[PDB]
Amino acid sequence: ETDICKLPKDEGTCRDFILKWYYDPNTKSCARFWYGGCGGNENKFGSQKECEKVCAPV
């Protein structure tokens, strides 16, 4: 599906931490990660449900 969903998990930098979700193409599912608030990429969603809608196969 879109190549944003295949970007690596990127915890980024800064210390304004928010728990986000990213799509893991190796499990074909979304997982949690901590984002520091700076320096991330777009494989980054506020909820598992939104990550799954955008990126999951099914």
Curated annotation (Swiss-Prot):
Domain called BPTI/Kunitz inhibitor: residue spans: 5-55
SS bonds (residue pairs): 5-55, 14-38, 30-51
PTM annotation, UniProt: Prolines at the third position of the tripeptide repeating unit (G-X-Y) are hydroxylated in some or all of the chains. The N-terminus is blocked.
Residues under site feature: Reactive bond: 15-16
Compartment(s) of residence: Secreted, Extracellular space, Extracellular matrix
Job of this protein: Collagen VI acts as a cell-binding protein.
Similarity section: Belongs to the type VI collagen family.
Clinical note on disease: Bethlem myopathy 1C: A form of Bethlem myopathy, a slowly progressive muscular dystrophy characterized by joint contractures, most frequently affecting the elbows and ankles, and muscle weakness and wasting involving the proximal and extensor muscles more than the distal and flexor ones. The clinical onset more often occurs in childhood or adulthood, but it can be prenatal with decreased fetal movements or neonatal with hypotonia. The hallmark of Bethlem myopathy is long finger flexion contractures. BTHLM1C inheritance is autosomal dominant. Ullrich congenital muscular dystrophy 1C: A form of Ullrich congenital muscular dystrophy, a disease characterized by generalized muscle weakness and striking hypermobility of distal joints in conjunction with variable contractures of more proximal joints and normal intelligence. Additional findings may include kyphoscoliosis, protruded calcanei, and follicular hyperkeratosis (rough skin). More severely affected patients manifest at birth and never achieve independent ambulation, while patients with milder phenotypes might maintain ambulation into adulthood.
Subunit structure: Trimers composed of three different chains: alpha-1(VI), alpha-2(VI), and alpha-3(VI) or alpha-5(VI) or alpha-6(VI).
Protein name according to UniProt: Collagen alpha-3(VI) chain
